[PDB]
Amino acid sequence: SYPIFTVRWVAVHTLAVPTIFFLGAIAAMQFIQR
Template identity: 70%
Template sequence: MFNYKILLVASPIAFSVISTAFWLTRWEILVWGKQFFGVPSIQNRKEWIDSPLAPFQRKDGGYPVFTVRTLAVNALGIPTVFFLGALAAMQFIRRATLY
């Protein structure tokens, strides 16, 4: 018999890892297939246009896009939303039908 508890725990974690990898690839920070045996490499700098966020005196290579804050938002925020959704869903379970 399949244990759905493992699926309920693993699905938000898998979703956050896949989402983080997708967006870092989309933002051209993770580059797949350029290194040893297709292992992705991290290019931590991105060229930005000159704006108040990236002043003229910026260092060569641009602004560090992949930071701890990026990882925290993507990898920790998504499971938190799943958890809060589960708490909200539990408010509407009718207990009489469970017994």
């Protein structure tokens, strides 16, 4: 009854998709040694 893709959906995913990508990247960085 509600739609699924709105402007709000886009606004959420433009933030959340890169955020989860960056958090995975920053987590991997904690294991680098010099």
